[PDB]
Amino acid sequence: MVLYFIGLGLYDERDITVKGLEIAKKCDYVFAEFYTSLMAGTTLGRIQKLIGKEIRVLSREDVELNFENIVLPLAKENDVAFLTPGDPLVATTHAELRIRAKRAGVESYVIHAPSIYSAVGITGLHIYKFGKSMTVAYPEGNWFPTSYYDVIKENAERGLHTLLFLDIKAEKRMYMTANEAMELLLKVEDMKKGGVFTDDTLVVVLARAGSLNPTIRAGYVKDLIREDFGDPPHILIVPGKLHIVEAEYLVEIAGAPREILRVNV
Amino acid sequence: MVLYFIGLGLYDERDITVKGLEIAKKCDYVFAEFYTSLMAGTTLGRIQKLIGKEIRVLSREDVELNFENIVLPLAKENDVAFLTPGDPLVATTHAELRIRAKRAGVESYVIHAPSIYSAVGITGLHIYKFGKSMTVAYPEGNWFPTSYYDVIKENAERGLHTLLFLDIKAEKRMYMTANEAMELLLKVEDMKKGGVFTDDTLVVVLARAGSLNPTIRAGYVKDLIREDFGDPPHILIVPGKLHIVEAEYLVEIAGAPREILRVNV
């Protein structure tokens, strides 16, 4: 009679909360999805071994079109868990799955876990200063989407930081790199000539957040566009003007150049 | 000789990530602070029992003024952990403590935990639609803060939601309720009269996120300003223009008036 939405955290199998693990261990069935994101620092095998339950993986269609035919029926007469990378209900379409549960006469509870939305705090940027967030998407065929670029302009205009998720093909395991995102943005800039993202723009790159050894780097696009930030996933952040303390952190902790202490403050 | 900033999570001691618990268990000395937020579902005892260590609680002054004299010294010789509610670097100034660690020749690592900042996902509001966030601070003497009112206006104009952290004076056991935050906002509307926050403004209240049964309520200020949402902590959210599915969730899950189902696009 209960469905548990349990987050797995940021990077590996230990990023799940003690509450999340203990509850999942007492469930009769355990589902998971890895289409909204992947746990780059672990495997399904390691996650199963830790929970001690076999985990049936679901596709985007399994969830989006048949959550009520696949997961909810079992939740009617058992304790069922639905695992997802990060914090549950962060992924735009997930909240409504709770409405489905309600409609099916199933109770649902949410066990939270670390999300990249809060993990970026490790970049030293004050979290209250973040504005609208967006995802950078790959152009394709006759379609060049550029709204993420307009958002950077609108946020920075107001002194707000912009968090940019990079496109991902979880099935193909093809991640967009911070480098590809920057070059995409330089291309969009050349098209709109808006002066929003150039070689002189200051950006922050966060890779493998959650890991004990994440890669935190800050600098101008002209020097970072070709730097190796390691293995995915990659998160890109275009900061609005900086508070002196944020700059000091980026310089001391993320190796940013002294120049931002006068140029971007 | 290392320093770990370990988040304890949103509500009780089980909201700590497995990574955090296992590392906290092997540390030589364990420090913590409980003034940046409130964990209503646990006590210091349960935390000590859970990690098997004496925890010495620090005050805002011990941290802001003597972190480098109290904590950093031991980090030179032993492995130390600094426990904080939620995520250690979110809506705090704890990030700056890493700079102090570096300048003292001490290595630091951050272990994330579920933060209220991503927990907003449980309100059904798309977290990418959140704009700049702010804190509603208690008036002090003749000084009456009002920036949080302008922020709501700014975000609303852009159709973005506004997350409002509520104030806290842990040394006096004071935790601002959503009700008090609403009262303060109506007063500010009085001074400014920008038509930003009134009896007809739709708001969302999330209380004690992280527990199995948090209070999630949505409605008009005229009907919510006197309603009891349980014990703290509470945050307050002033949504902008809603998406259809955001509205459906608020009504079905957060018990909002059916008529916010009709959006004025």
Ligand SMILES: Nc1ncnc2c1ncn2[C@@H]1O[C@H](CSCC[C@H](N)C(=O)O)[C@@H](O)[C@H]1O
């Ligand atoms: N479980 C919870 N439920 C509702 N609000 C919460 C909360 N935990 C924190 N808050 C809100 O945030 C304020 C403290 S701000 C510090 C936040 C913390 N680092 C984190 O990651 O969550 C509180 O006064 C309250 O308004």
